[PDB]
Amino acid sequence: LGLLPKPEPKVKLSNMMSVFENDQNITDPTAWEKVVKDQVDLRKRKHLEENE
């Protein structure tokens, strides 16, 4: 119904190469590295904030 935002893909270091949905996966390689690593560390850090 659209009350929640459509989920993005869940990237990892393995799914890194295979996700073309978001841009820059090749075009901006190290920025993309910062996006996937920042997103993984964001889910992990969100987990730690949940336990905390």
Partner 1 sequence: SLPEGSFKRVKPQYDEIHIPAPSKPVIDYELKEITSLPDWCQEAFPSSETTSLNPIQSKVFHAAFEGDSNMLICAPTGSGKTNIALLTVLKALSHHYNPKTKKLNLSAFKIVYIAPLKALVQEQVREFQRRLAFLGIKVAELTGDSRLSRKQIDETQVLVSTPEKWDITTRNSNNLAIVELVRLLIIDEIHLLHDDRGPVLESIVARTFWASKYGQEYPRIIGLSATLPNYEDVGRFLRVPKEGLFYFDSSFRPCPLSQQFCGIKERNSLKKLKAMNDACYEKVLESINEGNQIIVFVHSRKETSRTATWLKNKFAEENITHKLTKNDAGSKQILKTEAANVLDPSLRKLIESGIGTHHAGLTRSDRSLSEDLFADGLLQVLVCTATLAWGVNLPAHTVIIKGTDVYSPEKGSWEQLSPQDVLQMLGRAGRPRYDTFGEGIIITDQSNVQYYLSVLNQQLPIESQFVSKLVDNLNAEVVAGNIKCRNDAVNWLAYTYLYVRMLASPMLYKVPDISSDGQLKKFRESLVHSALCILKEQELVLYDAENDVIEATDLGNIASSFYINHASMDVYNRELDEHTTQIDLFRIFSMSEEFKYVSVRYEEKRELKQLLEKAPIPIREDIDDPLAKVNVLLQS
Residues that bind partner 1 (CB under 8 A): 1-3, 6
19 exposure class (CB count in 10 Å sphere: 0-12, 13-18, 19+) = middle
Total residues contacting RNA by CB under 7 A comes to 13
Select from 39, 51, 45, 50 the least CA-distant residue to 8.
Answer: 39
Cβ 1 to RNA shortest distance, Å: 12
Contact of residue 1 among RNA, partner 1, none (CB under 5-8 Å per partner type) = partner 1
Of 8-37, binders to RNA (CB under 7 A) are: 10, 12-14, 20-21
